[PDB]
Design a protein around this ligand. Structure first.
Ligand SMILES: CC(C)CCCCCCC[C@@H](C)CCC[C@@H](C)CCO[C@H](CO)COCC[C@@H](C)CCC[C@H](C)CCC[C@@H](C)CCCC(C)C
Ligand SMILES: CC(C)CCCCCCC[C@@H](C)CCC[C@@H](C)CCO[C@H](CO)COCC[C@@H](C)CCC[C@H](C)CCC[C@@H](C)CCCC(C)C
Ligand SMILES: CC(C)CCCCCCC[C@@H](C)CCC[C@@H](C)CCO[C@H](CO)COCC[C@@H](C)CCC[C@H](C)CCC[C@@H](C)CCCC(C)C
Ligand SMILES: *C/C=C(C)/C=C/C=C(C)/C=C/C1=C(C)CCCC1(C)C
Ligand SMILES: *C/C=C(C)/C=C/C=C(C)/C=C/C1=C(C)CCCC1(C)C
Ligand SMILES: *C/C=C(C)/C=C/C=C(C)/C=C/C1=C(C)CCCC1(C)C
Ligand SMILES: [Cl-]
Ligand SMILES: [Cl-]
Ligand SMILES: [Cl-]
Lengths: 225, 225, 225
C-alpha cells in the first residue's frame, strides 16, 4: 500500500500477532482457575488489537470525516479496538489489586464512556466540539487513573518494602502510559494537526504494543506480588 | 442553536450533568462493597445520559430517516443512551430485590431486545413496519415490567407493613414511569406525529431526568428497606 | 415480498417465534436458581433470532456491498444475531460442563472476535481480503470448538458409561453444527458464489433453527446428565 502509515500498521499487525501467539502457547499448562482468567485476558487483548490493526492496514478500519474545511482520514477502527481491550486491561489490574465488584463496575463503565466520547469526538464534523468531547473523555480518564492509583497504592501496602515498592512500578507504568493517549490524540490529526498522520500512527503503535504486549508480559509475570 | 428542541436538550444536559456530579461527591465516603456497587450504577447512569444529551444538543446524535414521504429528524442517540442506562437501572433494582443471577440475565437480555427493536423501529424506512417493531419492543417491556412487579412484590413482603407497603412506592413509580416511554414514542414524531418534535423532546427529557436522577436519589436513599 | 429468500426468512421468523413462545411457557414453574439461568439463556437466544430474522424479512437487516465488480446483497443482520446468541449458547454449554470463569471469558472473547471478523469479512469491499477475514474467523472457531471438545470430553468422563457416552452426543452435535457455518459462508454469496443466495439463506435457516430451537430443546432436556 501507498498511504505512508501502512508500515506502522503492518508493524502493529505483525507484533500484536506475535504477542497473541506467544500468549496462546504460554497459556498451555495452566490449570489454576485464576491463572486461567489472567491468561484469557492477557491473550485476548493483543488478539483483538491484531484484528483491528489489520482492518486499518487493509483499509477497512479507515473513514473520511469532514471538519475545518477538509476531508480528514480518521481510523475509526482504533476505537473498536480500545472499546474491548481497555475494559479487559482494567479487568486484569482489578483482579490483581483484589478490587471489589462495585469498583470494577465503576472503572469499566467510566472506560466505556471514555472510549465512547473519544469516538464521538473523533467523528464530530464541527471542529471546536471535538475538543469538548476530548475534555469529557479525558475527565473520564482522570477518574479511571484516579481509582487505579489508589487501587495499586492501597495494595502496594500490604506487601514488603521490596515487593510493595514494586507493585508501584506497575501502578506507575500504567498511568503514564494511558496519559499518553490524550496527548497523542490532541496533537495528532484527529485533534489539532501539529503532528502529521504517519507520526501519529507511529505514536499510537508504539503505545499499543507497549500496553498490550509489553505490559501484558510484565503484568502476567509479576504475579507473585 | 435554532432547532426548537435545543432548549430541552440543553436543560437535559445541564440536569444530567448536575446529577452525576452530585452522585460523584455523594459517593465519597463509601467503603462498603455493596454501597459501592449501588453508587457505581447510580452515578454512571446520568453520566452516560449527560454525554448522549450533549451529542443530541451538539447535533451529532441526530439523523434523518425517510418514511411517509418525508425526511424525518430522528435522534438515534437516545437509543445509545437507553442501551446502557436501562440495563444498569434494572441491575440496581435486581440487586435490591436480591434477585438471582438467572433473573438478572432474563431482564437484561429482554431489555437489550427492547431497546434494540426500538432503534430498528426508529430507523425503519417503511412507515407501517415501525409499529410492528414498536409492538415487539413493548412486548419485551411487559415482560420486564412483569418480572419486576413480582420481584418487588415478592420482596415487598418480608418486611413490615410500614416498610413493606413502601418498597411498593418504588415498584410502583418504576412501572408507571417506564410505561410512559412507549406512549411517548407512539404519539411522538418517531411513531405517529400526533405530538410535535419539540414537545416529544420535552416529554422524554422530563422522563429521563426522573428516572436517572430523580429516581436515583429515591433509589439510593431507601436503602434501609 | 419478491426477493426469492423471503420464504426462508419468513419460515425462520415463524419457527424462531414459535420456539421462543414454547420456551417462555416451559419456563413457568421454574424456581430453581440454576434452572432459571438455563431457561433465561435458552429462551433469549431464539427471541433475538426472531427479531433479526424479521429485520431481514422486512428488508431492514439487508445491505448492498460492492466487490468483484458487483452490488452484492449482504444480510448484515445475521451477524447482529450471532453476536449475542453465540455467546449465550456457549454460556449454556459452559455452565453445563461446570467450566470456570476464566474459560468462559476465553470462549466468549474468542467468539466476539469470530463474529466480529466475520462481519468485517462480510463487509469488505476488496474480494480477496474477505477470505483473509474468513480464515481468521475460522481460526477463532477452531479455538472455540477446541476448548469445548475438551470441556465436554472432560465432563463426559465423570459419569457412567450410559450417561458419559451421551454428553458425547451433545459435544458431538454441537461441533459438527458450528463447523457448517464457515463452509456455508465460503460457498455462499458472501464468500465464493458457488451456491446461490436463496439456497445460502435456506442453509443458514436450517442451521439457525437447529442450533437455537432444536438444540435448545436437546440442551434444556438432558439436564440430568
Ligand atoms: C457500561 C456502558 C458504558 C457506556 C458508555 C456510553 C457512552 C457511542 C457513544 C457512539 C457510536 C457511534 C456510532 C455512530 C453512528 O453514526 C451513524 C450514522 O452514520 C448513525 O447511525 C444510526 C444508527 C446507529 C446507532 C448505533 C447505536 C449503537 C449502540
Ligand atoms: C443480551 C443481548 C440482547 C440482544 C438484543 C438483540 C436485539 C441492533 C438490533 C440494531 C443496530 C442498528 C445499526 C444498524 C445499521 O445500519 C447500517 C447501515 O446504515 C448497516 O450497517 C452495516 C454494518 C453495521 C452492522 C452492525 C451490527 C452491530 C452489533
Ligand atoms: C470480548 C470482546 C470481543 C471483541 C472482538 C472484537 C473484534 C466490529 C469488529 C466491526 C463493526 C463494524 C461496523 C463497521 C462500520 O462502518 C461505518 C461506516 O460505514 C463507519 O462507522 C464509523 C463509525 C462506527 C464505528 C463503530 C465501532 C462500534 C463498536
Ligand atoms: C491498548 C490501548 C489502551 C491501553 C488505550 C488506552 C486509551 C485511552 C486512555 C484513550 C483516551 C482518549 C481520551 C482521554 C480523549 C479522546 C481521545 C482518546 C480516546 C484517545
Ligand atoms: C433513562 C431511560 C429509561 C428508564 C428508558 C426506558 C425506555 C423504554 C422502556 C423504552 C421503550 C420503547 C418501547 C417499548 C417501544 C419502542 C420505543 C421505545 C424504545 C421508546
Ligand atoms: C445461532 C447461530 C450459531 C450457533 C452461529 C454460529 C456461527 C459461526 C461459528 C460462524 C462462523 C463464521 C466463520 C468461522 C468465518 C466467517 C463467517 C462466519 C461468521 C459465518
Ligand atoms: Cl478488510
Ligand atoms: Cl458533537
Ligand atoms: Cl424493518
Amino acid at each position: 500500500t501507498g498511504r505512508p502509515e501502512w508500515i506502522w500498521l503492518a508493524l502493529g499487525t505483525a507484533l500484536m500477532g506475535l504477542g497473541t501467539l506467544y500468549f496462546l502457547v504460554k497459556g498451555m499448562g495452566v490449570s489454576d482457575p485464576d491463572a486461567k482468567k489472567f491468561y484469557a485476558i492477557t491473550t485476548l487483548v493483543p488478539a483483538i488489537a491484531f484484528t483491528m490493526y489489520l482492518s486499518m492496514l487493509l483499509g477497512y478500519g479507515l473513514t473520511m470525516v469532514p471538519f475545518g474545511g477538509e476531508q480528514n482520514p480518521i481510523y475509526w477502527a482504533r476505537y473498536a479496538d480500545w472499546l474491548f481491550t481497555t475494559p479487559l486491561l482494567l479487568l486484569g489490574l482489578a483482579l490483581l489489586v483484589d478490587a471489589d465488584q462495585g469498583t470494577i463496575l465503576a472503572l469499566v463503565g467510566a472506560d466505556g464512556i471514555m472510549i465512547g466520547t473519544g469516538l464521538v469526538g473523533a467523528l464530530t464534523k464541527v471542529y471546536s466540539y471535538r475538543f469538548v468531547w476530548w475534555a469529557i473523555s479525558t475527565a473520564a480518564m482522570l477518574y479511571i487513573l484516579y481509582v487505579l492509583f489508589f487501587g495499586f497504592t492501597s495494595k502496594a501496602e500490604s506487601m514488603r518494602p521490596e515487593v510493595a515498592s514494586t507493585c508501584k512500578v506497575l501502578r506507575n507504568v500504567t498511568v503514564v502510559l494511558w496519559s499518553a493517549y490524550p496527548v497523542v490524540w490532541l496533537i495528532g490529526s484527529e485533534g489539532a494537526g501539529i503532528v502529521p498522520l504517519n507520526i501519529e500512527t507511529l505514536l499510537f503503535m508504539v503505545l499499543d504494543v507497549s500496553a498490550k504486549v509489553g505490559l501484558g508480559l510484565i503484568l502476567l509475570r509479576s504475579r507473585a506480588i
